[PDB]
Ligand binder design. Structure first.
Ligand SMILES: COc1cc2cc(c1OC)OC[C@@H](C)Cn1cc(nn1)CCCCOC(=O)[C@@H]1CCCCN1C(=O)[C@H]2C1CCCCC1
Length: 128
């Protein structure tokens, strides 16, 4: 399914081109602007381990997930990936552990050396 699709077809959006963050745009958004470091960003997301084994969603909290971009509030892969997204866009990200929770993990939700998959919808973003 969707993780394997991202493996096969996703763009590598890392600076180092190490395939640590792979992206597919699933629904095109609008506008020239993408979120800049410091912006307050509003998303809906569905996320899981690539193994399918856990699944977390902003929709289960009946509220958007909000964070300030580049401020260390989220995993590196989100700071990188959401910076590439337009308002209205839905994207798939597949993320190696070096851009998420590494060798330590984040138990009990995230084991060591986990690959993560997310679908993210960019709802809105506002300048600091
Ligand atoms: C490692 O900890 C978690 C990871 C993830 C979700 C977490 C979480 O905490 C327990 O609970 C979400 C919710 C119930 C409470 N919460 C936490 C945060 N905001 N609301 C702040 C969370 C910051 C860390 O999360 C992230 O950086 C990423 C990207 C932003 C959405 C959440 N993220 C996750 O990694 C999820 C994770 C859950 C397991 C399946 C994969 C995704």
């Amino acid at each position: 399914g969707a993780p394997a699709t991202v493996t096969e077809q996703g763009e590598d959006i890392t600076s180092k081109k190490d395939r640590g963050v792979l992206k597919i745009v699933k629904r095109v958004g609008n506008g020239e602007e993408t979120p800049m470091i410091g912006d307050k960003v509003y998303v809906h997301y569905k996320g899981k381990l690539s193994n399918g084994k856990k699944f977390d969603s902003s929709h289960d909290r009946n509220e958007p997930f909000v964070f300030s971009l580049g401020k260390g509030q989220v995993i590196k892969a989100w700071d990188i990936g959401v910076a590439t997204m337009k308002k209205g866009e839905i994207a798939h990200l597949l993320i190696k552990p070096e851009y998420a929770y590494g060798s330590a993990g984040s138990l009990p939700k995230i084991p060591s050396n986990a690959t993560l998959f997310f679908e993210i919808e960019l709802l809105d973003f506002k300048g600091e």
